[PDB]
Short mmCIF file of C-alpha atoms and ligand atoms in Angstrom, two decimals:
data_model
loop_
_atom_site.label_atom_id
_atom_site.label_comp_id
_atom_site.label_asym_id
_atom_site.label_seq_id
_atom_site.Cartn_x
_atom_site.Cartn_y
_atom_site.Cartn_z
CA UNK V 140 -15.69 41.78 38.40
CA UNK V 141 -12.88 39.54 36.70
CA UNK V 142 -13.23 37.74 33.53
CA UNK V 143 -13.80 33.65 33.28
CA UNK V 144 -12.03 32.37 30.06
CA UNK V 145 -13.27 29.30 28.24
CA UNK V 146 -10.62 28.05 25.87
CA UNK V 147 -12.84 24.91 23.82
CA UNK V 148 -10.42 23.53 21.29
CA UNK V 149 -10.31 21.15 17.94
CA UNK V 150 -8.72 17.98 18.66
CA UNK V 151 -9.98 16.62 15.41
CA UNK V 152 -8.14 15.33 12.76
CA UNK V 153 -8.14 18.07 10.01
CA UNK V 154 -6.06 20.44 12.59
CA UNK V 155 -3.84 17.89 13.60
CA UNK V 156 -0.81 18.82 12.29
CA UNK V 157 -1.47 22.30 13.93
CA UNK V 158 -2.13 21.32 17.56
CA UNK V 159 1.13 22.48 18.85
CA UNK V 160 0.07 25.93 17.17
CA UNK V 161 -3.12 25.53 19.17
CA UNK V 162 -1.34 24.80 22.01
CA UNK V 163 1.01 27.95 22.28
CA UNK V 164 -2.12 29.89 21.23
CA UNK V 165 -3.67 29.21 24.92
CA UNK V 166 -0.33 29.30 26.82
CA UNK V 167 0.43 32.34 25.17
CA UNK V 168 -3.44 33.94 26.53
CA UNK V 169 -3.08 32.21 29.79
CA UNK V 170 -0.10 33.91 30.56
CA UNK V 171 0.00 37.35 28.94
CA UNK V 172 -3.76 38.20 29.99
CA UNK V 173 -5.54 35.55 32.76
CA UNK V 174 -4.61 37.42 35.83
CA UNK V 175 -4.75 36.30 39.09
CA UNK V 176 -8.44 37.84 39.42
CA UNK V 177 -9.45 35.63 36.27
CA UNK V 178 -10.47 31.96 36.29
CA UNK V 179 -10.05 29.69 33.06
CA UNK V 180 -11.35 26.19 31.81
CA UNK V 181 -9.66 24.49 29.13
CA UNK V 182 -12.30 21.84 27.05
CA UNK V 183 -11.37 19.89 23.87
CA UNK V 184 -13.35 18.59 20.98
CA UNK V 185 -13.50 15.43 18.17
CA UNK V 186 -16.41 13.49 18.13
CA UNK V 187 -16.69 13.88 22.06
CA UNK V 188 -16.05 16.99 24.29
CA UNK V 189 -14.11 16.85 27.25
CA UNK V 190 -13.67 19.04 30.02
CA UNK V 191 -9.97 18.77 30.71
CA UNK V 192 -9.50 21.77 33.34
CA UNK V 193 -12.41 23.05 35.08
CA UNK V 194 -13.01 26.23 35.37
CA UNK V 195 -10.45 27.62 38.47
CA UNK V 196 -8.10 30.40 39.23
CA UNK V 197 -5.44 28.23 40.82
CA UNK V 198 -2.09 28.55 38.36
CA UNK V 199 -1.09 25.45 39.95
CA UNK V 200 -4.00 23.70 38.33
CA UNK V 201 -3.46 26.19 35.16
CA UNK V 202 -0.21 24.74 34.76
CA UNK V 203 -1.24 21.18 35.00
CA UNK V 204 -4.17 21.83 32.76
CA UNK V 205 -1.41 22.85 29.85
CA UNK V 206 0.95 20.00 30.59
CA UNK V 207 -2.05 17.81 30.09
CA UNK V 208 -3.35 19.89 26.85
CA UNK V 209 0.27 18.95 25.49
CA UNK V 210 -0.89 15.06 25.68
CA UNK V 211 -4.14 15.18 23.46
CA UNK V 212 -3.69 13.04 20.25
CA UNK V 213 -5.87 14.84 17.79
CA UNK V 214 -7.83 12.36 15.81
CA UNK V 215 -12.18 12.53 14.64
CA UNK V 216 -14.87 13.89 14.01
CA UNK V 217 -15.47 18.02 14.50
CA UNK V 218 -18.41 18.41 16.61
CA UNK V 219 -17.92 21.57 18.46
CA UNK V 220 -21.21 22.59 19.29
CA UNK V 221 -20.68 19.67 21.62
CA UNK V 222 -17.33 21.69 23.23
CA UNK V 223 -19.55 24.88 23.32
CA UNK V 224 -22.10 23.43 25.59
CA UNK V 225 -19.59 22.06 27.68
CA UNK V 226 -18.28 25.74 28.38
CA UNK V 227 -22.47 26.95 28.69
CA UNK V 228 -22.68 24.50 31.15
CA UNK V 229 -19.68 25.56 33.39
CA UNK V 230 -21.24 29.61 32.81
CA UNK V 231 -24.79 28.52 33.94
CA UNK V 232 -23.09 26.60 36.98
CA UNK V 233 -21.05 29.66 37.95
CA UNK V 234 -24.23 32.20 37.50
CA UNK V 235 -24.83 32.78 33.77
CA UNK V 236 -25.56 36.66 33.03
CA UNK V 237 -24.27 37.14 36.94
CA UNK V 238 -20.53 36.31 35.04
CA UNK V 239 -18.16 38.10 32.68
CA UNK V 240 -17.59 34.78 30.73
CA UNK V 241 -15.14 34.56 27.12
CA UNK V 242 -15.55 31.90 24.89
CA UNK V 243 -12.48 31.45 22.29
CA UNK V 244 -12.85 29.09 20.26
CA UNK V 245 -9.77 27.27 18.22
CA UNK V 246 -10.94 25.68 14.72
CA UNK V 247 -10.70 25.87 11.73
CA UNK V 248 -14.00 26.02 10.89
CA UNK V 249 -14.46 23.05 9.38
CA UNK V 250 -18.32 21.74 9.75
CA UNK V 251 -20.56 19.38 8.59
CA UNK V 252 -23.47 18.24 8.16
CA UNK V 253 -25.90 19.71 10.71
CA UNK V 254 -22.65 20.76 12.83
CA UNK V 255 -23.11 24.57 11.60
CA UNK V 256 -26.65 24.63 12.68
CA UNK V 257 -25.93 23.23 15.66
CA UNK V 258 -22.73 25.49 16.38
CA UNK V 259 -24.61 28.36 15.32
CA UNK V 260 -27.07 27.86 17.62
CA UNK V 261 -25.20 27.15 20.50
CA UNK V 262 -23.44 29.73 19.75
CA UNK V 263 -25.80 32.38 20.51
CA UNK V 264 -27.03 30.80 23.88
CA UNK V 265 -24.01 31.40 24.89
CA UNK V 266 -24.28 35.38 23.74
CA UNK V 267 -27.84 34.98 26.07
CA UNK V 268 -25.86 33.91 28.57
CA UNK V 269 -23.99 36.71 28.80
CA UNK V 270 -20.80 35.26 27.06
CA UNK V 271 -18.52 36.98 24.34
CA UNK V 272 -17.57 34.59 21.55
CA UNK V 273 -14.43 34.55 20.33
CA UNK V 274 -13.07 32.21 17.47
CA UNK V 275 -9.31 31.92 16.27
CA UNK V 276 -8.99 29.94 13.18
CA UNK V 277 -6.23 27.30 12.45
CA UNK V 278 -4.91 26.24 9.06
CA UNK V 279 -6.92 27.29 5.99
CA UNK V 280 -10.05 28.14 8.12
CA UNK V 281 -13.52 29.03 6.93
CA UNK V 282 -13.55 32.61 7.86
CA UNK V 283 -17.54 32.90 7.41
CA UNK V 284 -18.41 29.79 9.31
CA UNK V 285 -16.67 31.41 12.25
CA UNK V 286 -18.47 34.76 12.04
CA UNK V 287 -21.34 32.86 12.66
CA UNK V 288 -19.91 31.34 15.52
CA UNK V 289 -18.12 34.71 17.28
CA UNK V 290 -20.17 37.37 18.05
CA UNK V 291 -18.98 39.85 15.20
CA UNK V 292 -16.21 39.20 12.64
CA UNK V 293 -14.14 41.52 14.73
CA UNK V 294 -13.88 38.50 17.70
CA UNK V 295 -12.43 36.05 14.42
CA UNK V 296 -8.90 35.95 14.45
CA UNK V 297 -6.18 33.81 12.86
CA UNK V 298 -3.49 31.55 15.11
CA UNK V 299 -1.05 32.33 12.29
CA UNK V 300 -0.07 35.36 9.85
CA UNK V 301 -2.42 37.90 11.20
CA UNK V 302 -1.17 41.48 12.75
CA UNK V 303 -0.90 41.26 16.20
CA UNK V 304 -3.50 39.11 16.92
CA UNK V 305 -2.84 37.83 20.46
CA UNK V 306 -2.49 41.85 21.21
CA UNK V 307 -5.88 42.70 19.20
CA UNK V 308 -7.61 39.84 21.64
CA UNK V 309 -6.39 41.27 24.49
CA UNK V 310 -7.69 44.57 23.30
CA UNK V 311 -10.44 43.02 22.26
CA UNK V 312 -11.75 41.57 25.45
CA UNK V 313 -10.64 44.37 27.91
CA UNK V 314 -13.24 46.65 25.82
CA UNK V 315 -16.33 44.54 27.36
CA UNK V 316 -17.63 42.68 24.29
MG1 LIG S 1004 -12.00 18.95 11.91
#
């Protein structure tokens, strides 16, 4: 069994000035720790979600999927319950609790309205789906609106200033979660 790695990311405005952080962030995953036995799906987020790579193992694709993540204009709303059922979708379509399927989440946690219920929510159908939730916060980040999100405050992470986060991850995932 091989791991299927759903990278749904912020393109909304309050982490625009961080989306090249965001960016490096998912290379940085892609190619340290999606091997060849791994699939991935890149999906962004404002006030619509897109699926921008579907989920494949092809690093041709990969590679096209990160020169097209470099284009995205961050601008909007922050509705990311709307990126995580974008990513439940793809996990019931390739066999729900049949898949090893990560969700990592890049935010900063910044919600409104009804968006935490929502998110929440979402959140764990995905964990019913079989999923591990992972969340890596940009900027000043909420860090409790995220534990709500990931599956434990151990799968919250920062993009910036933390000890070896993309190494902890790693770690992280490779223990089953
Ligand atoms: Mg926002």
């Amino acid at each position: 069994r091989a791991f299927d790695l759903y990278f749904v990311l912020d393109k909304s405005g309050s982490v625009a000035n961080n989306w090249i952080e965001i960016y490096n962030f998912v290379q940085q995953l892609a190619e340290r720790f999606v091997s060849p036995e791994m699939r991935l799906s890149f999906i962004v987020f404002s006030s619509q979600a897109t699926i921008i790579l579907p989920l494949t193992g092809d690093r041709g694709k990969i590679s096209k999927g990160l020169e097209d993540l470099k284009r995205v204009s961050p601008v909007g709303e922050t509705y990311i319950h709307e990126g995580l059922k974008l990513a439940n979708e793809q996990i019931q379509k390739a066999g729900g609790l049949k898949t090893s399927s990560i969700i990592i989440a890049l935010t900063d946690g910044k919600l409104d309205g009804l968006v935490p219920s929502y998110a929440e929510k979402e959140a764990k159908i995905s964990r019913s789906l079989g999923a591990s939730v992972y969340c890596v916060g940009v900027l000043d980040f909420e860090q409790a609106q995220l534990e709500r999100i990931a599956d434990s405050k151990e799968q919250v992470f920062p993009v910036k200033g933390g000890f070896q986060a993309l190494k902890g991850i790693i770690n992280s995932i490779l223990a089953q979660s």
